[PDB]
Structure 1
Amino acid sequence: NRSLIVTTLLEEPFVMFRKSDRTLYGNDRFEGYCIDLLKELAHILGFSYEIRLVEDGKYGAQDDKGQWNGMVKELIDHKADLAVAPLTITHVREKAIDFSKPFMTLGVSILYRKGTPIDSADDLAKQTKIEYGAVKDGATMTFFKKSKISTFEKMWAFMSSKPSALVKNNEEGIQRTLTADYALLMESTTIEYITQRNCNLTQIGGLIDSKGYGIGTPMGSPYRDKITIAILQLQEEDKLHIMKEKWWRGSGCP
């Protein structure tokens, strides 16, 4: 009956500061695919919300003692009711929080400058001249850390010995690919957005795995089921496809 606390972080084109001459405040500060999604869920389900940026700016991972951070920790501590963001649904996380059914499907792939004609992950793993890494404390990093696939094991070994291989966020990571001989391990629908706008960057290879984004909730949340059905209904009508086209719609690359 109360407004729901929504945790998030800034990530183009999912959650961004809207442009204005005015100083903005409250929910009005934000726009993007997840905000559009949040509005539709709120309309369909009849709830209100207050959006808050997660203080540590992280999605969430476990430390050596097994303690979480990021939005995942916000849910665990019940400081937020929902995590509305491009939050990857993973089995390791389902151990701490719950998820709606996925609202978007994606996979891990490679972002790299057009040039050295690498064609796959295997090529990166067998060398060190081209450094590579991932966003710290995100799903992609954790995927590598936990993998039993020989190649990805080789990659994690490399990433974790190399001090700045793992970057604070996408913005930092993308910049590194543009200024250093560096490849970023990143999620594919994001790679898609970036390579349409940065014509010297490209995706290398295809998708190495396949997973989903979902809305996070505290374990046992009373909103989770209701969110899932609304999401399912949005997909049936191709609305999430249309919504994506809206925010990915950009000026192409020769």
Structure 2
Amino acid sequence: NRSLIVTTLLEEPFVMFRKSDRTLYGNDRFEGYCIDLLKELAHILGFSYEIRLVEDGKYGAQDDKGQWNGMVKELIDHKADLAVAPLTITHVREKAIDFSKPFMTLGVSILYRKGTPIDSADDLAKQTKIEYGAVKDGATMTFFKKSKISTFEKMWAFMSSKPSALVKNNEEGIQRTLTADYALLMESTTIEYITQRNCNLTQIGGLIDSKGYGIGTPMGSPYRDKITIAILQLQEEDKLHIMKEKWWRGCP
């Protein structure tokens, strides 16, 4: 019996500020893959909504007291009804919030410049010349912090130690990659987006793991299963694959 508060953050090409001469307001400020997804979901399920950028600009992770930040935290405190973004479904987050079925698959990989001898995460772990990190308080950082795998523990030790290696967001990580001897642990669909538009960057190795993006809701929300049903409809209508190709579609 109302509109929903949709939380999200700026991340190319998922959610971006549209270009317009005249000043746009409210939901009209945004375009991108997730904005389109949101429009399709609101249409099918018949709900109205308002988009708010999350204040601390973070996806979400736990401190030592066990308290969350980022979009995940917004759902916990019922300040939002849906998180509509490239929000990684993880078993850690499932303890605190709920996720629809995935609308896109991805895995962690490495973004780095072309031409080097580096071919895998192990090659980065072995050495210390080349620095490497991940986005701060995102799922990738959490993957390394929580890993029990010898190599990844080693890499978390390194990351965590260097005072600069954990970057505010993807844009800052991309800039560190371009500007310094730095490799970014990054999700593969974004690496795909970046490497199509920057011929001097490449993906290093394959996927370190495998997961998906899903719409987040507060735990117990009835919209979770409704959103899952709408996502399944769109996959059946092949609308998600058309949507990807529109926002993702050359390097010699």
Q: Indicate the TM-score class for this superposition, using the shorter chain for normalisation.
A: over 0.9
Task: Measure how far apart 1:235 and its partner are.
Answer: 1.2
* SS of residue matched to 2:183: strand
Q: Which moved more, 1:143-152 or 1:209-218?
A: 143-152
Residues 181-209 of structure 1, C-alpha deviations (whole Å, 9 max, x = no match): 00000000000000000110000001110
Question: CA–CA distance in 2 between the matches of 1:131 and 1:107?
Answer: 21
Cα separation, 1, equivalents of 2:50 and 2:70: 18
Deviation of the 1:150 alpha carbon: 1.2
- Runs of 4 or more, structure 1, over 6 Å off, are none
Tell me what 1:205 maps to: 205
**Mean Cα displacement is larger for which, 236-245 or 167-176?**
236-245
Identity of matched residues, %: 100
**Secondary structure in 2 matching 1:90:** coil
Note the C-alpha offset of 1:242.
Answer: 1.0
Q: Deviations over 1:25-59 (max 9, x none)?
A: 01000000000000000000000100000000000
State the alpha-carbon separation in 2 of the partners of residues 24 and 56 from structure 1. 23
Q: CA deviation at 1:222?
A: 1.6
Q: SS at the partner of 1:109? A: strand
Cα shift readout 1:54-76 (whole Å, capped 9, x = no counterpart): 00000000001100000000000
Greater mean deviation of Cα atoms: 230-239 or 17-26: 230-239
SS of match in other structure, 2:235: helix
Q: Distance in 2 between matches of 1:235 and 1:145?
A: 34
What secondary structure, in the 3-state scheme, does the structure 1 residue paired with 2:51 have? strand
Unaligned runs of 5+ in 2: none
Deviation, structure 1 residue 232: 1.1
SS of alignment partner, residue 88 of structure 1: coil
1:253 aligned residue? 251
Match of 1:118 in 2: 118
Q: Give distance in 1, aligned partners of 2:232 and 2:125.
A: 38
What does residue 139 of structure 1 align with? Answer: 139
- CA shift for structure 1 position 115: 2.6
1:23 aligns to what SS in structure 2?
coil
Distance 2:220 2:91 in 1: 16
- CA drift of 1:117 comes to 2.0
Task: Please give the per-residue CA displacement for 1:136-162, whole angstroms capped at 9, x wherever unaligned.
Answer: 000000001111111111100100011
Partners in 2 of 1:42 and 1:160 — Cα distance? 41
When the two structures are superposed, what TM-score results if normalisation uses the length of structure 1?
Answer: 0.98
Shift of 1:120: 0.5
Separation (CA, whole Å) in 1 of partners of 2:116 and 2:37 = 39
Specify the SS of the correspondent of 2:145: helix
- In the aligned structure 1, how far is the partner of 2:223 from the partner of 2:57? 24
The alpha-carbon deviation at position 238 of structure 1 amounts to 2.0
The separation in 1 between residues aligned to 2:148 and 2:210, in whole angstroms, is 16
In structure 1, the residue corresponding to 2:241 is in which secondary structure?
A: helix
| SS across alignment from 1:159 | helix
TM-score scaled by length of structure 2: 0.99
Any unmatched runs of 5+ in structure 1?
A: none
* Superposed CA RMSD: 0.6
What's the offset of the Cα at 1:116? 1.6
